[PDB]
Amino acid sequence: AMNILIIGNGGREHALGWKAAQSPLADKIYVAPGNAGTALEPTLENVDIAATDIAGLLAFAQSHDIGLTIVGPEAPLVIGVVDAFRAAGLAIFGPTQAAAQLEGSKAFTKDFLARHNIPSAEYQNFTDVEAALAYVRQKGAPIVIKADGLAAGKGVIVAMTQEEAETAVNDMLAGNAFGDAGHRIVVEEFLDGEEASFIVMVDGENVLPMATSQDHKRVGDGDTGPNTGGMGAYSPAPVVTDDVHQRVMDQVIWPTVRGMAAEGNIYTGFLYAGLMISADGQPKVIEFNCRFGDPETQPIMLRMRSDLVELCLAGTQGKLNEKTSDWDERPSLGVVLAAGGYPADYRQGDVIHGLPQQEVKDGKVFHAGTKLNGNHEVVTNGGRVLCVTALGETVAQAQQYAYQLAEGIQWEGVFCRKDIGYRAIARGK
């Protein structure tokens, strides 16, 4: 068996570590730095090294006979943890710094999507109110107008009528004409439809798709309030039909993987695509970003019947084309429990009461922003604190069970959406 290192401290990393621990191919499994959930997990050992301390991480891997490292979050990737590990001969599943630009830089990706003709939102920047008005007159509504400097919730206008679009442009650029006020807007195509997260493993040349999922990015029930990292997800996502899946692979995933290689930035690791699927079943890329992996990873790992270590090892050896993935036929669903105030300011340090003292059948509480202190109290340590995850025979039953398991977990200001899964439950799924 091989010792395994998971880098990071979110709920995705708890889930990855928990799943890895099931592999007969794994001996010890470490999480750097991990969180209270991985501390509590008997099969995982937290290591007190920051996810962005590359020298510390490499020293650890070189001293604890780590046969495979799996990287969850963005921060270590964009500073080249993968480059460092590979220079030292260590097997690591994640993108190089250069490849990580696709997930780390919105500008890099907009340019990439354009030059590869990958479906995504058209956009144009303006400082001149007359050029902007001519452009929104040409495109017509619906259309999105964005500016910086305004109050929270007022920087993005989704204009649904021509007047709304003209008003937005005129209001957000007001003062540039006569006063050189210095304002700037971006006008972007409105992507309508339904969201899906499409996650794949990539070995440079081959791709192994993970189960589909649907996250709930707005903080409030009924898709209201500000955006977040994601308030809960379920798998699989019915909006991704077999036909839509083919279109995603053909129009998005293969062009992306091939394009990155063609530019001399071969991509390896998980690739998390946030998509909008139109009513006619056509995909558009919102972003490639690690936010399309948490809390999406949690329900996916509950459903995975394949060996995660096996697959990630194949992903470091160029062998994904030899592998298949196996899944529980049942759906799974996770509900995030968040600290009141998220995604704006929120309190840290609250003692969490009612956590499960034993694993239960068909459910799991994955920790994200939590810390286990010296008195064995678990305290809140982030905006998203837990993801209470369940399997069920239908999305409706998975939803019921997840909210059942969440019921006794308490701290001051705890909150969640109550409608995780609604778009699938509304279909009878």
Ligand code: NA
């Ligand atoms: Na997410």
